[PDB]
Amino acid sequence: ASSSFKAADLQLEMTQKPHKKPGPGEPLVFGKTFTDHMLMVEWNDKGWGQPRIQPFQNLTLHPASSSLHYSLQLFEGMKAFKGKDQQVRLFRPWLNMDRMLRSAMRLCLPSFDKLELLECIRRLIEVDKDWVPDAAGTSLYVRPVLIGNEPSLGVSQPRRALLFVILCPVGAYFPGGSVTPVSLLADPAFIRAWVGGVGNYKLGGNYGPTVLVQQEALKRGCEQVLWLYGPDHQLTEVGTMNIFVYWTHEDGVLELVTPPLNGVILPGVVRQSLLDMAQTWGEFRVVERTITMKQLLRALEEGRVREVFGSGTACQVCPVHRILYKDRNLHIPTMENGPELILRFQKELKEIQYGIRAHEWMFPV
Amino acid sequence: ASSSFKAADLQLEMTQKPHKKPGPGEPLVFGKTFTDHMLMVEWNDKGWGQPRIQPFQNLTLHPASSSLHYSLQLFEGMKAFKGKDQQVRLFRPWLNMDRMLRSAMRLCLPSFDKLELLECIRRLIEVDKDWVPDAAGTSLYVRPVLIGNEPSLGVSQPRRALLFVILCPVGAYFPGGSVTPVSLLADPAFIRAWVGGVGNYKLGGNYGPTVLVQQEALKRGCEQVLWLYGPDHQLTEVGTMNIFVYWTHEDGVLELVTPPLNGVILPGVVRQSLLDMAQTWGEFRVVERTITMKQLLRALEEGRVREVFGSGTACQVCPVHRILYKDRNLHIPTMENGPELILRFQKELKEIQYGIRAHEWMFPV
Numbered sequence: 001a002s003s004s005f006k007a008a009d010l011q012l013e014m015t016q017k018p019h020k021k022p023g024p025g026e027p028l029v030f031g032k033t034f035t036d037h038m039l040m041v042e043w044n045d046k047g048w049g050q051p052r053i054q055p056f057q058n059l060t061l062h063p064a065s066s067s068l069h070y071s072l073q074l075f076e077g078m079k080a081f082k083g084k085d086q087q088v089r090l091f092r093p094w095l096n097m098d099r100m101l102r103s104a105m106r107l108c109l110p111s112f113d114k115l116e117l118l119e120c121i122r123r124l125i126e127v128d129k130d131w132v133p134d135a136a137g138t139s140l141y142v143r144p145v146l147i148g149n150e151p152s153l154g155v156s157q158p159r160r161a162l163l164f165v166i167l168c169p170v171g172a173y174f175p176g177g178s179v180t181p182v183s184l185l186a187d188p189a190f191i192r193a194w195v196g197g198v199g200n201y202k203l204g205g206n207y208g209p210t211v212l213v214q215q216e217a218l219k220r221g222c223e224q225v226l227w228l229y230g231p232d233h234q235l236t237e238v239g240t241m242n243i244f245v246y247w248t249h250e251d252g253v254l255e256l257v258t259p260p261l262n263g264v265i266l267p268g269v270v271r272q273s274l275l276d277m278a279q280t281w282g283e284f285r286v287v288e289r290t291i292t293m294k295q296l297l298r299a300l301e302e303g304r305v306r307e308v309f310g311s312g313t314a315c316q317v318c319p320v321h322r323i324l325y326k327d328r329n330l331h332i333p334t335m336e337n338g339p340e341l342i343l344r345f346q347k348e349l350k351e352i353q354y355g356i357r358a359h360e361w362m363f364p365v
Numbered sequence: 366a367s368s369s370f371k372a373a374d375l376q377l378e379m380t381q382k383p384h385k386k387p388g389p390g391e392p393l394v395f396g397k398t399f400t401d402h403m404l405m406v407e408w409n410d411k412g413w414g415q416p417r418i419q420p421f422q423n424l425t426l427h428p429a430s431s432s433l434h435y436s437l438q439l440f441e442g443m444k445a446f447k448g449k450d451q452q453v454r455l456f457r458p459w460l461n462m463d464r465m466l467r468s469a470m471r472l473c474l475p476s477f478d479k480l481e482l483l484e485c486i487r488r489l490i491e492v493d494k495d496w497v498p499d500a501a502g503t504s505l506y507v508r509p510v511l512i513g514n515e516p517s518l519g520v521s522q523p524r525r526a527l528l529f530v531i532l533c534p535v536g537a538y539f540p541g542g543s544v545t546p547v548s549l550l551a552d553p554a555f556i557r558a559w560v561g562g563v564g565n566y567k568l569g570g571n572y573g574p575t576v577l578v579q580q581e582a583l584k585r586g587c588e589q590v591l592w593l594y595g596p597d598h599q600l601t602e603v604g605t606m607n608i609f610v611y612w613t614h615e616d617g618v619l620e621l622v623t624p625p626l627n628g629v630i631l632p633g634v635v636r637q638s639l640l641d642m643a644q645t646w647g648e649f650r651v652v653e654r655t656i657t658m659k660q661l662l663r664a665l666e667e668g669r670v671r672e673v674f675g676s677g678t679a680c681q682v683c684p685v686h687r688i689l690y691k692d693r694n695l696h697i698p699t700m701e702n703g704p705e706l707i708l709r710f711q712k713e714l715k716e717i718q719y720g721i722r723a724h725e726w727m728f729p730v
């Protein structure tokens with residue numbers, strides 16, 4: 001936690017051998033193709049070094065690096081979009097910079113200046129501005145990472161750290177413009193996070209354990225995992241996305257609900273953007289309240305449920321049409337009802353993100 | 366073939382630039398000084414490559430390596446002792462190989478042959494045999510590591526992996542030529558692991574979150590953290606060691622009790638060795654059973670508690686003399702009572718580990 005680094009001290013080293021761009025008409029799979037440059041800033045005793053943009057390359061880590069033994073690592077994830085006016089913009093970057101600072105502090109990694117980092121990221125995207133796709137639904141995924149880098153096997157606060165950022169072009173989540181549903185496996189046996197735990201931070205350690213559970217879901221015929229918490233089986237998250245339910249509550253009011261930030265939930269940026277956007281329309285009750293399987297099951301049998309979806313940077317708004325709970329199939333009417341609300345959220349985010357409409361959430365590069 | 370590498374096709378690359386070995390009259394900070402060679406075996410969609418012993422060097426990782434983003438990493442820890450007779454021996458290596466295989470499978474990493482790996486580690490050690498100290502209480506710490514290494518940001522099973530092993534000389538714990546207690550901070554606010562969680566595996570992800578809590582202990586005036594679990598505040602672990610309590614239980618019987626393996630406890634090798642050793646003496650009741658703070662307090666007031674200690678490879682047997690619970694000091698009579706039992710366990714392990722006495726637990730290098 002020492003005096004930050006300055007974007008003003010940014011050293012830039014253009015690449016010698018530019019990677020071959022993907023090229024229109026080619027399959028863009030999520031996070032598999034990377035741009036030409038990367039950001040890199042190191043930390044140690046005298047504090048931060050000067051930030052540098054340099055050619056994309058491999059990292060040289062000491063075998064005893066704490067990032068590889070004790071998981072002193074955290075990451076972030078956000079997107080940049082290119083509008084028809086050829087301008088590139090980042091979606092509410094400030095929220096990500098804040099989340100990252102908090103995660104850093106939870107792991108005892110060096111704090112830094114949120115705006116300086118933001119500026120450095122803007123310069124990086126500027127350098128690889130040509131990598132940003134402009135098709136439909138495409139964008140640039142930005143991946144900042146901060147890791148401890150102490151060459152010691154002692155479990156302690158790092159005296160050396162490393163912060164880098166890489167970029168990669170990602171195609172439309174829904175090829176064709178049409179949204180498609182996903183089935184979810186809901187099994188109480190699996191717990192991704194506990195209160196007093198660290199599930200409300202974007203730390204590597206929270207995902208490794210989920211790989212096995214995801215395979216278990218696929219084998220059962222489901223695409224994603226619905227994480228349940230507590231004896232009351234309350235819904236918390238879906239895969240790596242926040243969960244929303246559009247229904248008529250028990251009291252007869254039409255509402256949109258998502259679980260509260262009780263500690264076992266990651267504060268999604270898209271999640272916050274949906275609440276804000278919905279609060280603004282003032283067309284129905286928008287609330288943060290606990291949701292349990294029983295409440296869901298009752299609503300389903302009474303036909304009060306309209307749409308259920310997941311939210312996250314990867315898949316802005318993701319429709320859910322089926323849940324496998326206790327070896328029992330629960331069909332969710334999401335698609336037969338539109339999905340009206342989902343389609344609306346989608347259209348509005350698209351106009352804001354692609355510059356069709358001027359908005360303060362967008363950060364120009 | 367494919368599914369497992371073999372010691373038989375091990376490739377050797379002796380270093381050609383030896384490092385200066387520490388001197389007996391020097392410090393020896395736990396995981397800070399490393400030997401000349403390391404073991405390395407890679408894996409991919411096909412299968413394992415040939416294992417190789419090579420000069421100690423840095424790792425070259427692709428910036429998108431899943432080991433750095435999703436914590437697909439696990440490790441092990443064991444010791445080798447230079448017997449008085451000049452012979453080097455490993456302490457119950459088989460239990461570590463098993464624990465490692467289980468951890469690998471929990472993270473969807475490649476399985477391997479436990480005995481083949483053991484043989485490779487023996488060769489590694491043999492090669493660096495002269496690095497093993499022969500002072501008093503000194504030994505060689507062996508650190509195997511297995512990490513996912515696929516260059517993709519998708520949260521999924523790795524198609525690439527990397528297994529390496531490094532060695533480092535370590536001196537006797539606490540004072541070196543003595544036994545000294547540690548104070549513990551017991552605060553329910555901190556949860557190390559939960560049932561259905563992954564705390565019973567040696568995965569990097571379980572330690573990163575503990576750094577902050579350890580600092581919080583130091584500022585409170587304690588050397589270690591006592592992890593409590595559940596509304597009933599049951600004792601589970603101490604820092605990175607298993608916990609044992611030596612007392613006269615409610616029923617008037619003298620016993621040694623340690624928490625049961627219910628999921629939130631890492632199956633310690635030393636822990637298992639203490640239970641075995643104690644059961645063999647048949648001098649008192651040796652049991653695995655839940656222990657709660659309340660039970661501990663009542664026994665402290667009636668003066669039924671004799672010794673409380675932690676166990677682990679780093680510190681075979683570690684005395685506890687104080688616990689800070691709810692901003693209240695609880696003095697533990699461990700030292701005033703000898704610690705008779707702690708010293709007995711110590712003496713016996715020393716004779717077995719240093720070859721003074723022939724035993725099946727020791728593995729000759």
Ligand SMILES: *Cc1c(COP(=O)(O)O)cnc(C)c1O
Binds near residue numbers: 077242270313314
């Ligand atoms: C990234 C993430 C989210 C969603 O956050 P966004 O900022 O909206 O991308 C939700 N849950 C988990 C576990 C996540 O990792």
Ligand SMILES: *Cc1c(COP(=O)(O)O)cnc(C)c1O
Binds near residue numbers: 442604606634678679
């Ligand atoms: C390594 C470890 C232990 C003790 O295991 P040993 O095999 O006896 O070294 C106990 N708890 C945790 C959390 C550990 O990491």
